Amino acid sequence: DHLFREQLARNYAFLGEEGMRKIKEQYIVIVGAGEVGSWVCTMLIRSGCQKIMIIDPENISIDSLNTHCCAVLSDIGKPKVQCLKEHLSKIAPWSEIKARAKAWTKENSHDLIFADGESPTFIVDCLDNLESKVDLLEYAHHNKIDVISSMGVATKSDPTRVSINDISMTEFDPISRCVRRKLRKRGIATGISVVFSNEMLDPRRDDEALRHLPELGTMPGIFGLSIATWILTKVSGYPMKENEVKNRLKFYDSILETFQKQMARLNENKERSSLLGLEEVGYIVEEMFRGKSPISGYSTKLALTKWEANKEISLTNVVLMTKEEQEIHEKRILLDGEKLTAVYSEEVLDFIERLFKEEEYYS
Amino acid sequence: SDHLFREQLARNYAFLGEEGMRKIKEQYIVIVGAGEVGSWVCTMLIRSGCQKIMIIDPENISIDSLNTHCCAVLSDIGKPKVQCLKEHLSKIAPWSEIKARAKAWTKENSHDLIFADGESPTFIVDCLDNLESKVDLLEYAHHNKIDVISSMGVATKSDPTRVSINDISMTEFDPISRCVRRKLRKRGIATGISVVFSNEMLDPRRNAVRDEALRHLPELGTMPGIFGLSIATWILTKVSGYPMKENEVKNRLKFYDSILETFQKQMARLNSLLGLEEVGYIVEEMFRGKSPISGYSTKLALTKWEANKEISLTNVVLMTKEEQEIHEKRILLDGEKLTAVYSEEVLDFIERLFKEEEYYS
Ligand SMILES: Nc1ncnc2c1ncn2[C@@H]1O[C@H](COP(=O)(O)O)[C@@H](O)[C@H]1O
Ligand SMILES: Nc1ncnc2c1ncn2[C@@H]1O[C@H](COP(=O)(O)O)[C@@H](O)[C@H]1O
Ligand SMILES: [Cl-]
Ligand SMILES: [Cl-]
Ligand code: NA
Ligand code: NA
Ligand code: NA
Ligand code: NA
Ligand code: NA
Ligand code: NA
Numbered sequence: 083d084h085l086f087r088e089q090l091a092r093n094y095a096f097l098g099e100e101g102m103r104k105i106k107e108q109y110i111v112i113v114g115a116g117e118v119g120s121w122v123c124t125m126l127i128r129s130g131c132q133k134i135m136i137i138d139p140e141n142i143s144i145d146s147l148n149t150h151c152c153a154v155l156s157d158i159g160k161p162k163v164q165c166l167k168e169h170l171s172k173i174a175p176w177s178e179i180k181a182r183a184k185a186w187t188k189e190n191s192h193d194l195i196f197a198d199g200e201s202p203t204f205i206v207d208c209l210d211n212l213e214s215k216v217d218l219l220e221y222a223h224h225n226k227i228d229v230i231s232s233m234g235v236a237t238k239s240d241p242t243r244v245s246i247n248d249i250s251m252t253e254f255d256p257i258s259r260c261v262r263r264k265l266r267k268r269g270i271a272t273g274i275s276v277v278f279s280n281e282m283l284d285p286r287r288d289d290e291a292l293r294h295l296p297e298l299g300t301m302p303g304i305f306g307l308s309i310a311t312w313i314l315t316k317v318s319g320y321p322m323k324e325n326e327v328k329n330r331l332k333f334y335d336s337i338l339e340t341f342q343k344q345m346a347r348l349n350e351n352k353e354r355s356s357l358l359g360l361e362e363v364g365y366i367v368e369e370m371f372r373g374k375s376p377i378s379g380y381s382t383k384l385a386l387t388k389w390e391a392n393k394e395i396s397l398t399n400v401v402l403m404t405k406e407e408q409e410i411h412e413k414r415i416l417l418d419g420e421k422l423t424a425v426y427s428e429e430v431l432d433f434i435e436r437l438f439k440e441e442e443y444y445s
Numbered sequence: 446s447d448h449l450f451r452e453q454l455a456r457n458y459a460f461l462g463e464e465g466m467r468k469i470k471e472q473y474i475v476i477v478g479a480g481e482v483g484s485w486v487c488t489m490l491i492r493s494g495c496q497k498i499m500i501i502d503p504e505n506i507s508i509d510s511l512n513t514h515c516c517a518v519l520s521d522i523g524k525p526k527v528q529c530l531k532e533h534l535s536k537i538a539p540w541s542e543i544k545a546r547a548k549a550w551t552k553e554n555s556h557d558l559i560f561a562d563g564e565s566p567t568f569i570v571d572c573l574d575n576l577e578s579k580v581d582l583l584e585y586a587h588h589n590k591i592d593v594i595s596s597m598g599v600a601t602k603s604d605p606t607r608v609s610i611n612d613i614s615m616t617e618f619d620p621i622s623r624c625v626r627r628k629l630r631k632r633g634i635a636t637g638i639s640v641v642f643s644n645e646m647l648d649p650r651r652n653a654v655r656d657e658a659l660r661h662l663p664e665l666g667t668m669p670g671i672f673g674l675s676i677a678t679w680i681l682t683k684v685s686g687y688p689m690k691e692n693e694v695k696n697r698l699k700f701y702d703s704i705l706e707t708f709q710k711q712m713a714r715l716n717s718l719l720g721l722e723e724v725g726y727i728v729e730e731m732f733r734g735k736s737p738i739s740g741y742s743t744k745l746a747l748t749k750w751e752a753n754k755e756i757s758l759t760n761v762v763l764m765t766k767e768e769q770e771i772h773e774k775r776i777l778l779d780g781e782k783l784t785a786v787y788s789e790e791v792l793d794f795i796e797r798l799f800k801e802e803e804y805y806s
Contacts, residue, residue: 091509096663128512129666147453154536172518239682241675245606296460299493300678308605311667315603
């Protein structure tokens with residue numbers, strides 16, 4: 083009773099009575115007991131949450147003893163969740179720790195997280211499998227739960243550059259790109275706060291399908307804690323920064339109008355023209371061409387245009403460019419209808435064709 | 446077996462390159478203090494490679510130091526902090542030699558502790574709280590040319606992004622760093638000592654008021670780790686042939702000459718003991734590169750404060766050559782009162798800035 087309070091005396095003195103009282107009553111769901119999740123579960127419990135749940139099927143491979151905070155030679159081949167509850171039941175016997183040695187899915191979530199008829203306060207994504215994460219975040223958002231997602235920690239080697247901001251604003255982190263694009267594709271643009279760092283290492287040997295490669299055995303720690311920290315502060319009501327968002331709705335509208343015009347010029351069907359709404363103009367400009375004309379590189383006064391004459395309107399057959407560039411394009415390649423090989427050089431058409439192949443991956 | 450080490454540490458091996466690891470193995474790392482930050486540090490370098498660490502921490506694993514310490518559990522409370530680690534780390538890294546030391550750290554024993562076995566220390570990590578001992582340590586680190594990192598403070602820290610690693614010189618902002626740097630500079634050293642710290646502004650809710658009797662307040666369970674992990678990350682990335690930010694220092698040595706030149710010149714126009722390193726302190730640390738009269742950073746100079754007192758650190762003020770000339774005629778030569786020339790708003794701020802400095806002596 084009064085022995086518990088002396089263990090966390092530090093946090094009681096910092097966040098206060100009102101703040102700390104609010105943390106105890108919460109219930110957190112950790113999806114991924116891996117090298118990054120490991121820490122959250124610990125730190126959350128060390129800093130003193132009574133109830134958390136860990137969801138991870140796989141066992142601790144000899145690999146993980148480089149990063150995993152609480153594991154040890156003796157825990158090789160222990161289900162990652164099973165090891166935590168064992169190495170946290172010596173920190174806090176008071177703490178209920180629901181350990182689930184099963185995989186998470188869209189279909190089992192309803193009957194697994196609500197278990198014993200109690201809602202969760204927080205979902206912490208600490209997954210690796212792209213296909214599984216996006217699904218979790220979709221489910222996390224659409225049910226309106228306070229939720230934070232870890233991005234990958236691969237290629238990262240400086241703890242100063244790490245950050246927590248809205249998934250929308252991870253432009254320059256190649257690791258995040260793979261998920262937020264796939265998550266944007268399902269409509270979710272700016273709902274989620276996430277960890278990551280804008281650290282690029284292209285001069286390394288290492289080695290357009292981008293993948294998770296190596297990682298420095300400390301960094302995952304940094305992430306885990308920085309999440310826990312961010313949880314602890316958000317939950318408590320301590321002052322933090324709000325997440326800035328990258329929705330240039332005004333800019334997406336102005337573009338759409340330059341496309342919605344083109345559809346009245348060509349005089350094409352209303353059942354194909356309405357397909358491109360504000361929602362999808364955003365995706366196209368921000369995630370595909372990254373606010374940059376693929377022919378030149380300019381970013382001032384752009385517009386959309388049907389890419390080929392004969393083919394239907396879709397993401398595979400459309401592109402943005404400078405007004406002047408779409409003026410030419412509209413006039414030359416599709417209205418007069420001459421082959422695009424004489425209007426555009428080799429260099430560019432290879433950059434375009436691949437830039438659709440990459441879009442066809444996320445479809 | 447070698448194979449154990451490699452297959453266990455593989456992901457790092459593949460990250461930094463075998464040539465990188467070779468160096469990590471060679472390292473003999475002294476970690477002074479193993480309380481919150483120290484504990485973190487120690488664990489990670491062992492866990493991430495290093496097979497030779499010394500730890501120096503008297504106090505025992507307090508029941509409160511559970512939401513902080515990196516491994517410690519209820520079973521091993523009331524146990525020497527250095528031992529607790531040795532046990533947990535010798536279960537994860539049997540290959541690793543962790544010479545724990547119950548004893549406390551002094552300027553005198555330092556050598557007879559660290560060099561005892563005969564191996565020269567490659568890297569020192571300050572994780573202390575007693576300011577005296579910390580300075581005494583950082584002092585020792587530099588005089589014995591040992592690549593050294595030092596935790597500053599985790600007091601009033603909320604933001605895991607603001608955590609920076611850099612030189613003492615650059616930590617102007619972080620309020621905690623002052624007491625540590627100030628003394629350090631006045632011992633005769635304000636460059637070379639790498640330090641982790643958050644320059645996170647003092648949180649408003651729990652302009653001429655600065656009297657440094659301000660100290661450490663409450664921690665936040667997670668933050669110590671951020672510091673620990675980061676200075677581990679740092680040490681690992683440095684030792685291994687891996688690229689790095691390369692922290693750069695704000696020691697305006699050129700400036701100090703040009704301002705001292707004004708002071709030295711004022712002495713020859715009147716009727717010289719003041720050092721260049723002493724000015725640098727007066728300039729950067731006390732007046733903070735800004736006149737207390739105007740606030741401008743341009744065309745600055747020194748000048749004897751009042752004619753009655755001896756030329757000391759508590760009786761020379763930095764200001765514009767504009768302000769030097771006026772002050773020189775009116776207070777040094779014409780012999781006027783101080784209340785007569787300068788506003789009381791200034792003369793207070795100047796008094797406090799001496800009562801600040803008065804402490805550090
Ligand atoms: N679909 C999934 N649902 C839940 N956990 C998963 C799923 N796929 C993988 N995991 C686990 O989550 C871990 C992610 O942690 P990490 O690789 O350290 O970021 C993996 O190592 C798996 O053990
Ligand atoms: N003079 C000293 N020499 C070495 N270690 C010290 C000295 N004074 C205090 N410490 C240790 O510094 C650590 C700081 O950790 P903490 O008290 O948790 O902030 C404690 O574990 C102390 O035992
Ligand atoms: Cl959120
Ligand atoms: Cl063992
Ligand atoms: Na809330
Ligand atoms: Na519109
Ligand atoms: Na150094
Ligand atoms: Na400290
Ligand atoms: Na930063
Ligand atoms: Na100097």
